Design a binder for this molecule. Structure first.
Ligand SMILES: [K+]
Ligand SMILES: [K+]
Ligand SMILES: [K+]
Ligand SMILES: [K+]
Ligand SMILES: [K+]
Ligand SMILES: [K+]
Ligand SMILES: [Mg+2]
Ligand SMILES: [Mg+2]
Ligand SMILES: [Mg+2]
Ligand SMILES: [Mg+2]
Ligand SMILES: [Mg+2]
Ligand SMILES: [Mg+2]
Ligand SMILES: [Mg+2]
Ligand SMILES: [Mg+2]
Ligand SMILES: [Mg+2]
Ligand SMILES: [Mg+2]
Ligand SMILES: [Mg+2]
Ligand SMILES: [Mg+2]
Ligand SMILES: [Mg+2]
Ligand SMILES: [Mg+2]
Ligand SMILES: [Mg+2]
Ligand SMILES: [Mg+2]
Ligand SMILES: [Mg+2]
Ligand SMILES: [Mg+2]
Ligand SMILES: [Mg+2]
Lengths: 151, 31, 92, 101, 131, 92, 144
RNA sequence: AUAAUAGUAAAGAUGAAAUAAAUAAUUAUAAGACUAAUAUAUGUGAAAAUAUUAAUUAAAUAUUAACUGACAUUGAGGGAUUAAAACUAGAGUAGCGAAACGGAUUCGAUACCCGUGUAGUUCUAGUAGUAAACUAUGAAUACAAUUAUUUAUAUAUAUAUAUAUAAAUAAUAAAUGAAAAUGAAAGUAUUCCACCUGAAGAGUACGUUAGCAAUAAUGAAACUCAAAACAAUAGACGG
């Protein structure tokens, strides 16, 4: 009956492509009065709690730390960008609830992010991380890719 | 026949195709 | 029932890079422990005294100790010696 | 230390006969090398004689032959006959299309 | 021809989970018996969680009541039943697979045949001679 | 209602993808190693790379044929090496 | 500006067919775009060597030769100037007809038709907007 | 692709670059095309082809029993089917992508790389009958020495193997061959069809036939030359 938005967990998503690394920190917000609403079916309640809304808090790329052009897709650019994210999560008091890490692709920044989170740079965030997962998107047939490059 | 020998036929076919395209073009202007 | 795969006749039976068991250096493991001992109890802590004494003796004359475990694999000698006998080739 | 890793010690079953070699490291290594899932046949429905296509509405049994992501396992891993592998794959694909797997 | 229908009905009311399934089985059963068809068996499979969230008629679902219906009908009637199931909002997923009767006239449901019971007589004779 | 509140835990994990690991709060680097093993046992990195550029069906078929042969060839090679080792052990 | 400058090879022994078919087209097309062009003339042996540009960096006068040689060499320069007449300004020849020479052509006055890329982007935007309009109609029919 | 949401200032691309309230993230909607694992194209199909699911119709296996009683093989002409591209109409058009216009690279770059991307790629109804349409190997029958591995059928039991008879595949003996190799044929024989007679000219010219068209089929001669080609050998060289 009253909006009671509360954070349930945080999602640390990393997209590691060939030319850049994108790191997004989000909050899974849950209106704790949703079940108190009128005209709400058992299915709508279960469907609302199975995919809770998300709000973006921190969005970073390798170009936000001053890496330009070809340097954006390198191991060092990702390692420093991961550090800046782990710092901004502590400077915003967003290290109270559990964090779920979602990795998307297999570029050069995937192993830098993992190294920065299992090392000194991520000794605070790692303590809250509860689940790691992979979200690489594959196609079963799907659209035709571009032709092979003759180099 | 080997690729080497096939290449001679390839050149002859290319020149015939090139000549027929050229003839076509003329017919269009002359038509 | 387990599918047996039979090779065609081959010019050779050879392992490109035969694997060998290389025992770890005793002095390096001692150094890896002492370094860890200092990481927990602190540098020069009295708890790592024995480690320091052992490390000094291991490296006193040679920093890697008496390395006398060099080995080479004999699989390629036997493989070439026995291939004609065990390949199951039909008679001429 | 009064403790040894389980991988470095062999536990001789009860009622079995042993030789002095059974206390050596060679036995440990030999048991690892020749460690195959041969007891699957007696626990493998698809290696018993049933038709795998009769299990297209039983996702729990079919989920034993797919990886964590649902990828059908190659015959080299399942150890099934050509016919059963062919029938099992059809069952899984039909199960996926029905909305059960 | 003998056919095996597997339908995933929607569970709208958590209080009456097996309500739309009963209403649907009656609708399908009536079509079969009113068009020269025979209904051999109706095996409920219970409420199960769907492998994923599925959609139907601009609605989403996370669970469904599974049920099997072994029936005998003509090909034309079988297509009519499938068409009605593909249109009913209650049905989330429906599949009809033919059960070959070339070698024997009495075949049990795939679920039962998977358990070793090949005919309905074997199932009935295990409920009378031993029950 | 609460019926839709107390049955969300299983429901949440009932629709799993199989690409998730529960982190070991003690050794968090062992959980990332487990996740990498899943990726390699489902060929996720390989499939992604193979989907970047289109390959003609004929070329795809050739590559699939050659790969199978190399896989089968290696199994036949290992079978022959095992025979060599067994023969050597018995003095042949 | 180095992009505007395009280096070209015109050997002294070139045939007036290649000179008036390939080289003429190359020079004329480049000049029409607005790219500067420097034409380097030299003997076939040294002109086209690995040190194509490097040898010309090397740039007692060269001795005279049979007039036939200079009839060819001077004829080439006449053809070059006549070919590049309305497409560029007067040339700055820097060398001797008895040796290497660097003709330095410069594009003639040409206004900037830079408003072409504006149309390009506008057309792309128009197509995208038309696609959206079409997709709205699909959603409407689906709803209806 | 669009919209919303918070959240920002770069993003995207490349060998490196540059051309054209975002990117990323979480939702919702729409559209077209495609079909991950299994998977070996194994198998099936005359070939071309054929691997997401179900159904309908058609065809396809082995053995046994009975029946017909040479009714067979091959096959000029003929007929049917036939990848991709292309073409004629009507739809569709996400992604890909000749061309075109741009950005780079380069001594130059009418290319390789990048962008925007039209035809085409998709479906329906047709035209056309061409591919390294290849196993570069027409079809059928009789026959000849072995092994291994699967598959199928059958038999037996001291119930899970064992013993048989076929098929397939792999490696071979003999034989054949210019050799490379073939291996149940490229062997020993028989029957029928197609095709070839130095290179180049030329699958061209002309004519004819067919097609909306692109084209497809048929298919020469003159002049010139003493060449031209295959397998294998030893070298030299290889970004
Ligand atoms: K095949
Ligand atoms: K007779
Ligand atoms: K006849
Ligand atoms: K004929
Ligand atoms: K299109
Ligand atoms: K024939
Ligand atoms: Mg890079
Ligand atoms: Mg493109
Ligand atoms: Mg020939
Ligand atoms: Mg986006
Ligand atoms: Mg597939
Ligand atoms: Mg085959
Ligand atoms: Mg015939
Ligand atoms: Mg094809
Ligand atoms: Mg059209
Ligand atoms: Mg261009
Ligand atoms: Mg240019
Ligand atoms: Mg392009
Ligand atoms: Mg036709
Ligand atoms: Mg042709
Ligand atoms: Mg032909
Ligand atoms: Mg083909
Ligand atoms: Mg026949
Ligand atoms: Mg012709
Ligand atoms: Mg040769």
């Amino acid at each position: 009956y009253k909006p009671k938005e509360e954070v349930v967990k945080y999602i640390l998503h990393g997209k590691f492509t060939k030319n850049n690394t994108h790191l997004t920190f989000s909050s899974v917000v849950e209106d704790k009065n949703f079940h108190k609403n009128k005209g709400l079916t058992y299915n709508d309640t279960m469907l609302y709690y199975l995919n809770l809304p998300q709000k973006v808090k921190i969005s970073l790329s390798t170009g936000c730390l001053g890496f330009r052009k070809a340097a954006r897709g390198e191991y060092e650019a990702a390692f420093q960008t991961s550090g800046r994210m782990f710092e901004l999560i502590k400077e915003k008091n967003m290290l109270n609830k559990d964090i779920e890490v979602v990795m998307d692709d297999f570029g050069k920044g995937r192993a830098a992010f993992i190294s920065a989170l299992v090392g000194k740079e991520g000794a605070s965030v790692v303590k809250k991380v509860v689940k790691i997962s992979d979200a690489t998107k594959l196609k079963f047939g799907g659209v035709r890719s571009p032709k092979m490059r003759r180099l | 026949d080997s690729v080497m020998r096939k290449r001679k036929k390839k050149m002859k076919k290319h020149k015939l195709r090139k000549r027929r395209k050229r003839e076509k073009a003329e017919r269009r202007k002359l038509s | 029932k387990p599918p047996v795969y039979r090779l065609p006749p081959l010019p050779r039976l050879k392992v490109k890079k035969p694997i060998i068991r290389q025992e770890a250096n005793k002095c390096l493991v001692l150094m890896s422990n002492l370094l860890q001992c200092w990481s927990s109890y602190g540098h020069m802590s009295p708890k790592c005294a024995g480690l320091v004494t052992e490390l000094k003796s291991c490296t006193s004359e040679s920093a890697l100790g008496k390395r006398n475990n060099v080995q080479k694999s004999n699989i390629n000698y036997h493989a070439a010696r026995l291939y004609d006998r065990i390949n199951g080739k039909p008679h001429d | 230390t009064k403790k040894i890793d389980q991988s470095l010690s062999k536990k001789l079953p009860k009622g079995t006969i042993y030789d002095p070699f059974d206390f050596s490291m060679g036995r440990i290594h030999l048991d690892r090398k020749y460690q195959a899932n041969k007891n699957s046949n007696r626990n493998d429905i698809m290696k018993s004689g049933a038709n795998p296509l009769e299990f297209y509405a039983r996702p729990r049994i079919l989920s034993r032959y797919v990886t964590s992501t649902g990828r059908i396992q190659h015959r080299d891993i399942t150890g099934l006959s050509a016919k059963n592998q062919r029938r099992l794959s059809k069952a899984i694909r039909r199960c996926q299309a029905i909305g059960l797997m | 021809m003998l056919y095996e229908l597997i339908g995933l009905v929607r569970i709208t009311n958590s209080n009456a989970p097996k309500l739309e399934a009963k209403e649907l089985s009656s609708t399908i059963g009536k079509l079969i018996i009113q068009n020269r068809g025979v209904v051999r068996d109706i095996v409920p499979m219970g409420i199960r969680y769907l492998p994923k969230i599925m959609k139907k008629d601009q609605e989403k679902h996370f669970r469904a009541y599974h049920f099997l219906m072994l029936f005998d009908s003509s090909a034309a009637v079988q297509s009519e039943i499938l068409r009605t199931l593909k249109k009913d909002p209650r049905v989330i997923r429906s599949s009809i697979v033919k059960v070959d009767l070339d070698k024997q006239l009495d075949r049990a449901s795939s679920l039962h045949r998977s358990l070793g019971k090949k005919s309905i007589l074997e199932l009935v004779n295990e409920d009378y001679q031993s029950i | 209602a609460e019926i839709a509140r107390s049955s969300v835990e299983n429901a949440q994990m009932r629709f799993n993808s199989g690409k998730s690991i529960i982190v070991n709060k003690n050794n968090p680097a062992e959980s990332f190693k487990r996740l990498n093993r899943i990726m390699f046992e489902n060929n996720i990195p390989g499939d992604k790379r193979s989907q970047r550029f289109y390959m003609k069906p004929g070329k795809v078929a050739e590559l699939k044929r050659s790969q199978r042969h190399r896989k089968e060839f290696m199994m036949g090679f290992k079978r022959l090496i095992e025979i060599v080792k067994d023969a050597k052990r018995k003095g042949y | 500006k180095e992009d505007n400058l395009k280096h070209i090879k015109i050997s002294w022994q070139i045939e007036s067919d290649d000179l008036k078919r390939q080289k003429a087209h190359e020079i004329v097309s480049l000049l029409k775009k607005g790219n500067k062009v420097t034409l380097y003339l030299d003997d076939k042996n040294n002109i086209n060597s690995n040190n194509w540009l490097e040898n010309f960096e090397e740039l007692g006068e060269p001795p005279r030769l049979p007039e036939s040689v200079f009839q060819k060499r001077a004829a080439v320069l006449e053809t070059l100037k006549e070919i590049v007449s309305e497409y560029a300004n007067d040339p700055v020849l820097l060398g001797n007809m008895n040796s290497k020479m660097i003709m330095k052509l410069i594009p003639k006055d040409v206004k900037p038709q830079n408003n072409d890329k504006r149309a390009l982007k506008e057309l792309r935007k128009k197509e995208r907007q038309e696609k959206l309009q079409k997709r709205i109609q699909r959603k409407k029919m689906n709803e209806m």
